Amino acid sequence: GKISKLGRSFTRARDTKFVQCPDGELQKRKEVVHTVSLHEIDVINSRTQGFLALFSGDT
Amino acid sequence: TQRIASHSHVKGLGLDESGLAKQAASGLVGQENAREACGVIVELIKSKKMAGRAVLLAGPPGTGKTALALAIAQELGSKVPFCPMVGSEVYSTEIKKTEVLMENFRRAIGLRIKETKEVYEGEVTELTPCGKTISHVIIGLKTAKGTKQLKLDPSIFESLQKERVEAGDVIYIEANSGAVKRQGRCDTYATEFDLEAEEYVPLPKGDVHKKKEIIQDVTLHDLDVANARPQGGQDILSMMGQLMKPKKTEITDKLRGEINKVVNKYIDQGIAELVPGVLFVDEVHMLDIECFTYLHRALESSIAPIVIFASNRGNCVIRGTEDITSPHGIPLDLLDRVMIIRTMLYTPQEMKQIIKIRAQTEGINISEEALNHLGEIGTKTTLRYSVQLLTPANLLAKINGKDSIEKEHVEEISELFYDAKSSAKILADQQDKY
Amino acid sequence: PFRDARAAPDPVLEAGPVAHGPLPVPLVLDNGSFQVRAGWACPGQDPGPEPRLQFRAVCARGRGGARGASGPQMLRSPFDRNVPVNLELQELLLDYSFQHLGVSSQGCVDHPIVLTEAVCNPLYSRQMMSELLFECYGIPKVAYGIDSLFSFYHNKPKNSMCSGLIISSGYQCTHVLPILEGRLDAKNCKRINLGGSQAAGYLQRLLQLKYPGHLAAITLSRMEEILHEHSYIAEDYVEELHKWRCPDYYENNVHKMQLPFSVFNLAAYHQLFVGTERIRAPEIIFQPSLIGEEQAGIAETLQYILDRYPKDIQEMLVQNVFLTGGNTMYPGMKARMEKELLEMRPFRSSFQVQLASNPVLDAWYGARDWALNHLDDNEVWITRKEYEEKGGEYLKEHCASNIYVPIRLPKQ
Amino acid sequence: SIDAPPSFKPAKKYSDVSGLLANYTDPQSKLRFSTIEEFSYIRRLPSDVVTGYLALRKATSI
Ligand SMILES: Nc1ncnc2c1ncn2[C@@H]1O[C@H](COP(=O)(O)OP(=O)(O)OP(=O)(O)O)[C@@H](O)[C@H]1O
Ligand SMILES: Nc1ncnc2c1ncn2[C@@H]1O[C@H](COP(=O)(O)OP(=O)(O)O)[C@@H](O)[C@H]1O
């Protein structure tokens, strides 16, 4: 239920950033490759919101 | 596949049934007199009778001390805890040095528990609570193998409510733990709206209900740590968990006393069994004189694990004394509490066998004429250096389009990567430039 | 490539094929909505030798006005939704059947008859079917029974008391019939307002919209061939149609239905490619929502009747699920039904699905075997004189018959 | 009183012109379709076959 907005279509740029409308079909099954350091698994597991210590350094 | 590493070829001590060693077996070669001794230690750990007994492996660098220590962990297998540590780990910034010793001594003793893991999963066909207030809740489940009904307690019902479960959702219940997981809405309802924020999953094709027998491993240290500080209780969902950062702390003596008393209750009731394991304090000469003195108490205690030590030092100064030399870098007072196993340097023929066993472990084909050359270079340098050159030699053989190591490949690599002895000769010559 | 159907056979017989023993050999008459099936009981022979008169239940009378015709040959038919509701168009259907079978001579048919009727039959309808039979044709005694239940009676392991669900699917209806101790539990029986007529009608209208260039080339009698020979029922529809989505499977499985010829001529004399259509026509009885129609369909209905019993007698009556009639002829029907049944039972429990030995003829063979046994059980039949004191809205409660209730119709 | 009950579940949405599952419906013709080529196809149909398809489902079309 997250919405991301990428601006407005060029044909209604009048009346903010502008872009052409997408190609292909509306609903795409996409596939995403993702990778995490072995450390970053360890820190997320340490605390109620462990991931903040991955920035603040309090690990 | 699994990554190859510095000891992955050793698979056990490889003794025959009489207890004597074979020349070459289970991925070790040589060292008969020194590794027959580990056989006796394995029988001692399997006997379970003793506590606090300890062993020292002694001998020069590259003579097999950690290989033998890991070979013991193979012969015991994953039933029995084996906790490795490095001497330098003692110097924490959160807790005193003897606390780190005591935690690691506890880690090497395991409770082994049995239970029947029992799982229900499928689409929720109905929820119906059952006077004044809810006595129980009936729930129905469906999969492509059939239907069941269950009778939940109000604690589980609270958990279903917290997961925001409603009829038509696909659910996993684990009956032992009281664990409850929502897995999405069942796809038969995927047309209720065109756009809605849920994720829809197909009706499960597996059994509605499954049973296993499982075995749980937990050490005494896990009981200590879990029980000492208040357990947080946050499945997140509670912002108070954000404020107080964790830290390690000196576990009090009183608490370990109670934990011992409660575990004795359960091993009388047959609910648990006990496995005394091994603590391997490697690199022992990095311990301080304070710590060496505390070991004189912990190795006497009628609860302690078997402890294995290893060291490579001659007659060096004991850390923290600024003055006193002692054999192996260990105080004489403690050295009179351990049995000592000596470890011996390899003859050229031994190194050839180790090199070939490393090659066929690491995946490399090598010709006899090249293997004789790594054998020679090992006598000039050290075994731990000849075994480094195998992979880079293979990688040049591959670049030059050939399957197998040949003399010119190892000869090229020898000119390209130096040894510590020959590099030190360069530093003695260009002395004024560094 | 399409065929054309046969017409106008030569059924002619002597005045009565009376065998040894009892002289009043009964007529066995399956009064179907799609077609009628009729013949002599022919007792003393184990295999029913000749179910004569296999013919479509449709009659011709056109702009000429002055004549009508009845055999296999604008058209009309006597039924509304599997109950007969026509006067003379029923008579001239019976007449055809009697005349081609032979009859004595005098001002009546001398032989008793067993006759199929609707799973429930409205009282007025039963009354009219009795009047149109006793008055005009003068039959001595009559029996009414249900097609499906005769087919079950035929297919039973033994001539003994039983329980089961009957799944039945004819021209314009499918029914789910729970039966207990040989009795139809008609209080909680249910039917679905769809059937093989509506499947053919849908497949027609699809192909008309697919090829508007030749509406005239496609017609019911050609829709029959693709629906009988070339269509099948999915194990799971949303998975079948998903494997039909890829072109390399499609070209290997699409059906090439060559029309007769007079550009390679297909721009009009097309090969009428049927792909997904060969699934979407059978599936109507499991998902009536492929048409406009909001009803439970053969899957939700079976669960909805089966949950209205105690959990022990469910496990009893599911031990004999039986498939019979018309639409059950599709290939794959047993597999789809037993898979759909596996999801709606207790996790380790058992069920059995039986398919009728001949799904279309077993209703008639059942009525044969029934009448040939119950010749002299005069509590079972309605005698000619009973119809003079009970007004025609009356029935005799034998097994394989609709449940009677005490009631009477005003008439003058 | 023998009629079967209405279904409880919401209806699946198959495409008109091929029968494959339809994620999509066109805002003007009100037919439903699975893929881009099917959307190209429907836009080239005359009004007669469009109302013809909708009439198979007793949709607003009368
Ligand atoms: N007898 C043997 N058989 C097979 N491989 C051996 C043998 N002895 C040593 N090795 C291998 O050679 C290397 C020797 O490491 P070794 O156990 O000697 O370390 P160490 O110098 O004794 O102690 P540390 O681990 O503290 O450096 C490893 O790759 C080991 O697996
Ligand atoms: N071989 C077959 N395959 C598929 N459908 C068939 C087959 N034979 C008959 N049908 C279907 O059976 C239906 C008629 O069955 P029938 O038992 O005679 O009906 P009823 O008893 O209501 O008159 C028709 O709609 C026809 O499409």
UniProtKB/Swiss-Prot annotation, chain A:
Cellular compartments annotated: Nucleus matrix; Nucleus, Nucleoplasm; Cytoplasm; Membrane
Tissue distribution of the protein: Ubiquitously expressed. Highly expressed in testis and thymus.
Similarity field: Belongs to the RuvB family.
Subunit composition and interactions: Forms homohexameric rings. Can form a dodecamer with RUVBL1 made of two stacked hexameric rings; however, even though RUVBL1 and RUVBL2 are present in equimolar ratio, the oligomeric status of each hexamer is not known. Oligomerization may regulate binding to nucleic acids and conversely, binding to nucleic acids may affect the dodecameric assembly. Interaction of the complex with DHX34 results in conformational changes of the N-terminus of the RUVBL2 subunits, resulting in loss of nucleotide binding ability and ATP hydrolysis of the complex. (Microbial infection) Interacts with Mumps L polymerase; this interaction regulates the viral transcription.
Notes on the domains: The C-terminal domain is required for association with ATF2.
Protein name: RuvB-like 2
Organism, scientific name: Homo sapiens
From Swiss-Prot, chain B:
Glycyl lysine isopeptide (Lys-Gly) (interchain with G-Cter in SUMO1) cross-link, renumbered residues: K205
Keyword Transcription: yes
Residue list for modification N6-acetyllysine: K433
Cross-link Glycyl lysine isopeptide (Lys-Gly) (interchain with G-Cter in SUMO2) mapped to chain: K205, K425
PANTHER family in UniProt: RUVB-RELATED REPTIN AND PONTIN
Record remark: domains: Binding to MYC is dependent on a Myc domain essential for oncogenic activity.
Name of the protein: RuvB-like 1
Species annotation: Homo sapiens (Human)
Gene: RUVBL1
Curated annotation (Swiss-Prot), chain C:
Record keywords: Coiled coil, Cytoplasm, DNA damage, DNA recombination, DNA repair, Isopeptide bond, Nucleus, Transcription, Transcription regulation, Ubl conjugation
InterPro entries: Actin, Actin_CS, ATPase_NBD
Disulfide bridges in this chain: none
Keyword match NADP: no
Keyword check for Membrane: no
One of the GO biological process terms: positive regulation of DNA repair
Protein localization: Nucleus; Cytoplasm
Identification of the protein by name: Actin-related protein 5
Organism encoding this protein: Homo sapiens (Human)
Swiss-Prot record, chain D:
Keywords: DNA damage, DNA recombination, DNA repair, Nucleus, Transcription, Transcription regulation
Main localization category: nucleus
GO BP of this protein: chromatin remodeling; DNA recombination; DNA repair; positive regulation of DNA repair; positive regulation of DNA-templated transcription; positive regulation of telomere maintenance in response to DNA damage; regulation of cell cycle; regulation of chromosome organization
Gene giving rise to this polypeptide: INO80C
Entry protein name: INO80 complex subunit C
Record organism: Homo sapiens
Compartment list: Nucleus
Gene Ontology terms: cellular component: cytosol; fibrillar center; Ino80 complex; MLL1 complex; nucleoplasm
Span of the entire protein shown here: 129 to 190 of 192
Subunit structure, interactors included: Component of the chromatin remodeling INO80 complex; specifically part of a complex module associated with the helicase ATP-binding and the helicase C-terminal domain of INO80. Component of some MLL1/MLL complex, at least composed of the core components KMT2A/MLL1, ASH2L, HCFC1/HCF1, WDR5 and RBBP5, as well as the facultative components BACC1, CHD8, E2F6, HSP70, INO80C, KANSL1, LAS1L, MAX, MCRS1, MGA, MYST1/MOF, PELP1, PHF20, PRP31, RING2, RUVB1/TIP49A, RUVB2/TIP49B, SENP3, TAF1, TAF4, TAF6, TAF7, TAF9 and TEX10.
Protein function: Proposed core component of the chromatin remodeling INO80 complex which is involved in transcriptional regulation, DNA replication and probably DNA repair.
Disulphide bond pairs: none
Superkingdom in the source lineage: Eukaryota
